[PDB]
Structures are given as C-alpha cells and as structure tokens.
Amino acid sequence: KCDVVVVGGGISGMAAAKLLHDSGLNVVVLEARDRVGGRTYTLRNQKVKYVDLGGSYVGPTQNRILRLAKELGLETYKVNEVERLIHHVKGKSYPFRGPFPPVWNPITYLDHNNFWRTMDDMGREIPSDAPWKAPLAEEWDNMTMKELLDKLCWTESAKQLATLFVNLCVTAETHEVSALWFLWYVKQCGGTTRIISTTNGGQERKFVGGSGQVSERIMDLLGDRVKLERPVIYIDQTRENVLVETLNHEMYEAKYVISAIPPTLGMKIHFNPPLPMMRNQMITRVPLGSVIKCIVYYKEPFWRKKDYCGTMIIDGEEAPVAYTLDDTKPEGNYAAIMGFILAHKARKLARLTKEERLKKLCELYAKVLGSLEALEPVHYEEKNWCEEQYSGGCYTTYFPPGILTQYGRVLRQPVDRIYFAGTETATHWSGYMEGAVEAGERAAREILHAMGKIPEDEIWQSEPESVDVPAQPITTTFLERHLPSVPGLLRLIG
Amino acid sequence: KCDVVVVGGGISGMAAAKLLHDSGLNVVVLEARDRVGGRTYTLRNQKVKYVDLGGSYVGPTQNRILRLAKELGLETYKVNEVERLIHHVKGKSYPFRGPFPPVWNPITYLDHNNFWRTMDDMGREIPSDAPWKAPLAEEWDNMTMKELLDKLCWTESAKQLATLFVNLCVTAETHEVSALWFLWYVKQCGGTTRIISTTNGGQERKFVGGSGQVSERIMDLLGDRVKLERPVIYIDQTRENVLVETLNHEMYEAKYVISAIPPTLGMKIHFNPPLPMMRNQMITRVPLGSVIKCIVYYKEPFWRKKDYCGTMIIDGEEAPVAYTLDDTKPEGNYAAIMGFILAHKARKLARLTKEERLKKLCELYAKVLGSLEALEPVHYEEKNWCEEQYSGGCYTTYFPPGILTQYGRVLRQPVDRIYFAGTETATHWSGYMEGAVEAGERAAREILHAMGKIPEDEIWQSEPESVDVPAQPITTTFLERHLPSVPGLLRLIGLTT
C-alpha cells in the first residue's frame, strides 16, 4: 500500500520516507541490506560499547542533520581537541595548535597561504546549485587536481599537504579527480577552513550512541513500512502505476519513486523503458572513493598525559594512515584512536590480514606519539567500504575530468515518475550525512509538488541555524588576505 | 543442460559458446536482448537491403574474426578507396592520396611526423599482455591524453589532428582518457598506420551481408541453446554448482560461467557472495564511449564521378561528423555515406530529431564534397549506442586517468568459477570484433583447462594468418625515422649558437 516507493534505506531515503509519511502519504522503503543506515553503520558490542564504522562527524552549518537528529532524540558531544595536534613530517613529530600546521620558512609560508587561499578564491566562482555554470567550467573540469596542484604550488611541502588534503576529503587521488568538481566539493561545505576544522568545523562533534541511531529511529516511526533484505532489481514505468520489483520476487506499485541510492548504483536496476541516454551513460561515469576506517582501542587515553589531543596529520607514502582523530567516548571510557587508510593505500593494504594492519597502525601511532603504550592495543575494529556491494565505496562519489560539465545536470533530473535523492545530489555539504538530509527532503517535496500539494516555491527550503551548535563565522588575517604568492613576490622584483 | 553458462550473446559469448560446444560440452547462452550480436547489429529492410548499424569493418592482422567468419560461410569485400580522399580544413576541401592528409608547411610537417612517430615510440614500451608493467606506467597513466598532446604538439594543426584521432578511435575526449591506456590501445592494434588505414589497415573490408551474420549463424549451430530475452540478474556461488538467475525468473545451474558482457555491465548482476573488493570497484570505474552511427543513402555514388572516393576527414567543432567512409554495396547498389557523430557531439546532437540530424549531415556533405546532390537523400538510418542499456556505449570501454594501473589486472582475473571474456579483455585488437573472438575463445579454453581437458600451455593460442586477406607489413621512410621534432630542431640550431 504505497503512494511513493523509496529505494534506499540510508539517511537520505529515511529522511524522505519520513517527510512524506508526516504529510499523510503511504510510503514504503525497500532496502537491500539487513539493516538501515547504509554508509552509516554503528557497531555495538561489549569491548566497544558502540562505534561508528561509517559516517560519523557533524559540525556547525550542518543544520539539517543536527535538526533531524535532535527531533529523533539524539545528542552530540565534542570530539576531543583540548590538547596539542601533531604534524608528523619527514620522520619527526611537531606539535601545534589551531587548524593548520605551522610553517616556518618564509618562502614556503607564502606558498602555503596562497594555496589555501586560491582554493577558496576559485571556489567563489562556482555555484553550488550548478557548478557547470562556472565561468571557467570547461577549463577547470578538463583538468585534474594533480595538474592544478602542479601549477599552483611552488614548494614541495605545499604540494604534499595539498595532496593529503585532497586524499583525505574525497578518498581519491589528485590525478583521479576533476579540478572543477573538487573545488565545488570544498566550496559547498564552506571552504577550506570549515571543511578541515575540528573545533568550529566539520569534525567538531559526534552523536552520543552512534549515527546509525538516526535511520534506525526513523525505521521505528515507520513500523512495518521499511522492508529489509529487499534489493530492487527492476523498475517498470510503461503502465499507469510504477512497478518496482525486488530480488526475492515481491512486486510493489506506486504513483512515484525516490531513488536514494548512490548514483552509480542505479546500474543495479533494470529499467523499462530504457533510461534516457544521458542518465544511462552518466551512471557509468561516477565512481565512489576508497577508504578503510580503523579504530584501535587502548586501556587509557595515554596521549593526553603527553599533552597530545590525539590528532595526527601524517605526511609520506610509507605511513598507512595520514589522519587520525581521538575516538574516546565523552566519559574517559573506551579510549581509542580513529584513522583512515585512504585511496591507493586502501587497495594496497587490503591485501594484508586484519592483524597485520593492526600491527602497522600501532607501530605508526607509537612512532608519531612517541610512546611504547601504543604498541599495546586492548581491541581493534575496521571497515573496508571498498567491498560493500550496495555502497560501492566511501565516503561519496567523485567525478573524473570532463564528466561534471557533460553529465552534471543529469544527477537530479527526474525520469518520469522517478525522483533522485541521496547525498550526491545535495548542494550544501553534499558528500556528508547533512547532504543526505537535504537531498532526501527535497526529493520528497518534489513529489509533494507534483501531486499539487505544495507550490514550486516550497521545494527547496532553507533551514534555521542550530541553537546547540551555533556557527562561528570564518575570518581571515589582513596578512593572510594580502601576502604575495611565490610568483607574485618574484614579480615584486622583476 | 549446462556444463558452462555463457552470459552475453555477442560475438565474444558466441565465439566461446561454440568452442566449448565443438569440444563436446553442454553450454547455454543467456542473452538479455531479443537478438544476438550486441554491439554488432545488421538492419535488414527494403530501402537498405542490409546495413551495419554497429560493428562493421575488418582488416589485415584481424585473423581470428576473419577465420571464424570464413568457417561460418561469410565473405568480405573491399571498402571503397579507389578515388581521392578529402581533408576538409578551415572551411575548404583538399583532396589527397595515402593514409595521412599531407601537410605543406615544413615546421608543421616536422611536428606532425614527430607526433605520429612518438605515439608509436611510447607504445613500443607497453606490453599488450599487461600495459600496467610499462616502465613509466604510473606517470603515463596519471596523465590524460590532452595533457600528453599539450606537451607533445608544437603546432595547433597537429594538436587538432591528434585530437580527432583520439575522438575517432575511442569515442571519448582527450581529457577523458588516460594516456597510458590510449597508447596501449593504439599499439595493441599494430600502431598508428595500422589503426588509421583503410587500404591495408583496420577499415579495409566489410562482410557481405552484414556482421550480425557472425553471431546469428552461431545461434543456428546451437539450436535451442541460445535463450533470448534472458537478462541475467543474480549469480550465486555459495553451493557446489553455480546458480544463474534471469529477470523473468528462470534458474540455470552450471559448473562454470563465462561473463562476456562489457566490464561495467556486471554492475547489473547481483552477486553472492559479494565480489572481491577489487572487481566490485573496478566495474564502476570503466565507462564506454559515445557515438551515433549515421548512414545517408543516395540515388548514385555521385562523389565518384568527381573523383572523390567518399572518405572525408573533417576538422573543426561546428561539423557534426569528423570522419566518413563510403558505404555503397559492392555492386554499385544502394549508394551511401557512413559517418560517426563522436564523443561530446553525440551528446549535443542527440537533442535534435532524426530529421534535423539528417539535414545537418547533408548540408555538411554538400559543403565538403561541393555538390548539391548531397542535399537529396533517398533514405536515412542511424543508431545512437549511448542509449543502449545492455551496451552502455560504443565502440568499447575507456579508462580514465589512474584506473588502468590500479584496476588493470582485475579485468580478466577469474572469480571462483566465473571467467571473463568480452573484447575489452583481448590483447590484440581489443575494442574490435577481432578482440571479441580472442577473448571469447581464451575464456572458453580457460574452463577447458580447469576441467583438466587441455594443458595450461594451450589456453592462449596463436592464429594462422588469413589467406584471403594477407597482411602487408608496415614500413617507414628513412626521412620519417630521422627528421627532428620541432624542439629537436630548435636544439639542432642552438648547437651552432
């Protein structure tokens, strides 16, 4: 008994399922896996209490997920940043404060500052709405992030940090991704400072008890309406009602469909009539990134006694993990260090066993933190999202050179009675649980409008700022704004 | 009755289905569409007699498809190249002979000759077998064709021809594709001259009566064994026998499976257990190209009376088609001009209607050939492969930067009892009907060897050269081999100063 069938049981699909349900429509969520959540997964066991193996951090400006979470009963806590962060470079650890690791060489400094600034400068020229309408869309999209970096960075030290920055943001290589798309990505989160910041940015907080809780609690509000172990394999739009068919043979009929699965994963559904050419091809050109999330558990948060907060930014090819955060529960309990094994390394180290990875991570953390204690883990958890069939990767989808301009506007164009959600279709914090909410609700409202229940006026809604997580605005030093680039200085002579 | 289930009813799947069948095994071909052939499709109707709307040309060195075709009863005929070809550049038409349009400016000449030569030089370093083992695999793979071209080409005239060359070979933009992969592609066909040549190259000949005939005639040899309208949707390897399930609900059980569908199209099958991480992700990173094949029929082969053979190479953004060949049947009958609408243009002009495209093609062919007669088409056929669900595109699969080195060796690595065919897994003329044969048969022989019926020794077989289409070898002028590059000349005169 269905007005709308939502494909996809993740935050986006649930967010949508709920909005429709709240508005008095009969919905149904068909979910392939034996669990809701998708790219969020909260493991619960005795050694760990709870742990986010998937999507986890939420921050200021991410108002939608914060709102939906509150209403569903959930609370946040601050990720630990009281003590010092560590930038570990060329085999040595240098402690620091603030978002960016400091650089002492005045030339290198000019270069670094210019890089971050130019990402943001370039970004101001790309609309979130429609990145392909950027004045230099063609040029920028026809060129990789590695190219742009090779051009923009006069120092090896800045090329390397920039690379790490790209690797960490989108779990792909700089040579894999289009410049236009990457620049769009960063800007639709609020620029470099917002995206890279723990305190006052994207990694500020986590949900008490896990984020799996979000889509779980929505499943509760919907009773028997969410159907687990139901992978959709066929959508048929020939008749008056849309027929949607699952791998186990059940048939569902609906006036409308929200597809809230990752773009490329539409490949997994057979369509009748065939999809329009643009979409048929678009969905083969949009891969997801590669990451292993790893958590190592320790008797005590030892790092803090050495005045380290747990954050490590680790340069170099040999290091299996480039970025860590402290994962100790808000109490002091269950101390842990979180880390990502990114991009090409997620492929290299997947060859090893669970134990061999644990060993490599510990030896690293031991070197970086300079403490024997890191060699004594009390427990370990990991997830390699590269092997998930109904995910395709993590965190999100990336666009190779040339594809955003050409196939861009396809992603959220309705196909008859199919409407498209999922975070990759958001316009603010796309890539994140936030985007998942934006997209989920907009797609729902699109259907509402088609049924003539709300005006076009009302499809895209703005969101009131959170009271519990107010957003400090981002500011820049006069010197930051005005210092020359390395070439610019060379030009200030001859 | 199933020892091996073949998914994929195209030339590769059939080539395979037959090899196994001839060796006394019970096979089954499960095919999604209501026809075999796949990326070959031969339209038959009264206005046209027959027309290849899909894969069509065969040439010297393409011995496998040539052999399989002969044994199946088929014959070839030469594509028309008797008269002059046309290079149409900056609004004007310049007739010429030989494979390459001539260039007169001595500087530009050096640049052009060096470009073609360097494609081939770089290629000699890449193993067909395993392109990712090239000495400079990382560097080359991390970089797009547009990048390599921007670096290699000192003249705009050469950048443009090189771009067209890329567009035409792989139906993609230079900025879309990895340099390593592209250089591999060209070299596994026999280098630039072989790939671009009509006479004595890849476009020498067509099959009399169509190429759909190839897989069709194999369907005949197999009786009721090919099951049309059967799209596979689930493969299950948990048990002793592999279960394969179709969209209409039928179950098939087999000791082994050949998947002979385009790599990325495996996405369309749900697996149990899940695929290994590498494949699972590989198959999202491997798109197919974009092309519309367009044939315009005329009362007579009028071009020939003007001493033009029908070949047009057309530079420039405004032209909807960059390359045409003469499609007149070997008799003189049903005169026609064949042309491709490539890459980004395939997306742009799909917006228009059948008639609007015809008009644009006619106006172009009229300008290029300089004859009002082109404005008077007697009939028109077209296929836009971009809209094919069970194809994904045409002609073949292309690799974006970074993917070949990382995900390369995954393409033809067995997954338990699944073995992988399809042309994208060939090593000689991959991308082509030839490749489809190579890969089909190798896959089949892989299974044969797993059952201990033939030695490992015998999985990859070499192929005797055709008697009807012998291969003239490729040669180069002394001057071609030794003329400086543009930079090389700049160097050569900076050693007087």
Ligand SMILES: *Cc1cc2c(cc1C)nc1c(=O)[nH]c(=O)nc-1n2C[C@H](O)[C@H](O)[C@H](O)COP(=O)(O)OP(=O)(O)OC[C@H]1O[C@@H](n2cnc3c(N)ncnc32)[C@H](O)[C@@H]1O
């Ligand atoms: C995995 C990853 C993601 C991630 C992260 C770290 C990693 C390791 N860290 C994050 C961070 O800390 N902050 C944040 O905001 N997000 C972070 N994420 C990204 C985040 O997980 C995603 O942005 C978000 O969860 C996306 O949600 P969405 O709903 O848009 O996509 P999904 O979660 O994958 O849900 C899709 C559901 O659809 C089901 N599915 C797939 N195919 C089918 C078929 N064919 N039939 C029926 N159902 C299907 C999937 O199973 C899934 O449940």
Ligand SMILES: *Cc1cc2c(cc1C)nc1c(=O)[nH]c(=O)nc-1n2C[C@H](O)[C@H](O)[C@H](O)COP(=O)(O)OP(=O)(O)OC[C@H]1O[C@@H](n2cnc3c(N)ncnc32)[C@H](O)[C@@H]1O
């Ligand atoms: C389309 C294109 C191709 C082409 C060409 C021009 C264009 C417009 N010109 C060529 C040229 O002149 N010379 C040449 O040698 N080849 C040319 N081609 C390329 C050529 O067609 C291909 O290289 C070759 O045909 C590839 O064959 P292969 O067998 O390897 O791949 P396929 O033909 O697509 O066959 C696949 C079959 O599998 C079926 N399928 C797909 N999905 C499923 C599922 N899920 N279940 C069951 N069956 C499935 C497809 O329908 C297809 O029949």
Ligand SMILES: CCCCCCCCCCCC[N+](C)(C)[O-]
């Ligand atoms: C200049 C420091 C180098 C970059 C530091 C910022 C780390 C980026 C964190 C992005 C993590 C994204 N995600 C999904 C894990 O939240």
Ligand SMILES: CCCCCCCCCCCC[N+](C)(C)[O-]
């Ligand atoms: C230097 C002339 C410009 C390139 C001319 C060669 C045309 C390449 C033909 C490739 C066609 C491939 N295919 C599949 C249609 O056979």
